[PDB]
């Protein structure tokens, strides 16, 4: 943390944050969501970390270089340690990325090493090559070298993500799937796990062995698992929470903005809210059905009438303001909603659905007052504009993510937030073999467009290919884009260091501090 000369700090440097839901896991190789990564940044530290404005900065790696953007050399700081006092070496990075790549780990982010184009990942992922073949190597204890199959200019931006953080082999090999329990876990970030009571709290305390420990201010942070955005806010107002999770209740927001204007933080956010369609299951394997649902949803009602928190109506998957995106607005988004409804109705008639034998299906969401309210509104809009009958289902966060990966659904509420600020952070998730493809979408034409982005000379050409890849995805109606998110959350006035300027929201509790109040 960089406390402003002049500010006085409080005596007790404790922080309470809501975290949206109970994490899937604390193992960096088993996580995929925002709740999981909020915890993961305070516990595990990879090669690079984000600074308070979101820029890639020194993490375990104090300095690095690249050869033709294809060979990256990371110089690890000589004092990096694990919470047990042991040294963090380039060998821990070797072992960890091999464990991420191994199909036996089953990581939802195994494909992050494919996004980075590390040599040999595809065969390793396919089980054709053993994980020991991965293009990484410890040149010496403090020198980690990565070799990629194509130049990847933004390679370093990928590295602040939890799946490329190191995991402690001794703990992992001795305790198996119990390595993350408090009595067993070994960590390397600014904090260490003090307590974890399922569905109640996660308590982290300062990790004295952190290399940047003199700059850590907050001695303890608790993360709550509250999925009701109403209860999160209520507990914030009662004084129990200093930082709400960043999902705001529709019910109370207008009230909050007028009653405590300066605690309502509302900042840019590279996330997209959409309805995920299970592309591999009839009748969702018919593009006419997918397109009719995409066109019949009325985003203006959703964004401006039901929610009205500053979200922008969406027509793509990658947010148009991502760095390096220059997207082509599609024709259907230029029409009036009435015309969208008429085309939508024709498309479903063509697919054979009647007013008397309508298309019916489940609309699944992760338990939440926000998502429930939006899904009730969406079901009514679709009923009214297209004649579809939807049945709402809700699942708890962890269960919900497992359903999506397994394909045990029809249509699901969804949100993807960038892992790095560059369009392939969104576009790589729709690749046929990506481990993050819960759309179950497979388009050889889309895969090629993305693969050609690593084979071209200039950024102009890359940017045009990302626009064509968004167009192919829209033409296939793989999803129903709804809105681009704003990052909206309540932060008490004594919480310092939360600037709201990082469009990925990669908050580190070591960078925050309690102002005396
Ligand atoms: U437009
Ligand atoms: U269903």
Curated annotation (Swiss-Prot):
Where in or outside the cell is it found?
Periplasm
Q: What happens when the gene is disrupted?
A: Mutant cannot take up cell wall peptides.
| Disulphide-bridged cysteine pairs | 271-417
Q: Which Pfam families match?
A: SBP_bac_5
| Annotated keywords | Disulfide bond, Peptide transport, Periplasm, Protein transport, Signal, Transport
Induction profile: Part of the opp operon, which is constitutively expressed.
**One Gene Ontology MF term:** peptide transmembrane transporter activity
Predominant subcellular localization, coarse grouping: periplasm
Q: What does this protein do?
A: Part of the ABC transporter complex OppABCDF involved in the uptake of oligopeptides, including the cell wall murein tripeptide L-alanyl-gamma-D-glutamyl-meso-diaminopimelate. Plays an important nutritional role and is involved in the recycling of cell wall peptides. Binds peptides containing from two to five amino acid residues regardless of their sequence. Also binds cell wall peptides, such as L-alanyl-gamma-D-glutamyl-meso-diaminopimelate.
Write out the domain note.
Answer: Accommodates the ligand side chains in large hydrated pockets which impose little specificity on binding. Tight binding is achieved by utilising the hydrogen-bonding potential of the main chain of the ligand.
Indicate the quaternary assembly.
The complex is composed of two ATP-binding proteins (OppD and OppF), two transmembrane proteins (OppB and OppC) and a solute-binding protein (OppA).
In the record, the note on similarity to other proteins reads: Belongs to the bacterial solute-binding protein 5 family.
Q: What name has this protein been given in UniProt?
A: Periplasmic oligopeptide-binding protein OppA
Originating organism: Salmonella typhimurium (strain LT2 / SGSC1412 / ATCC 700720)
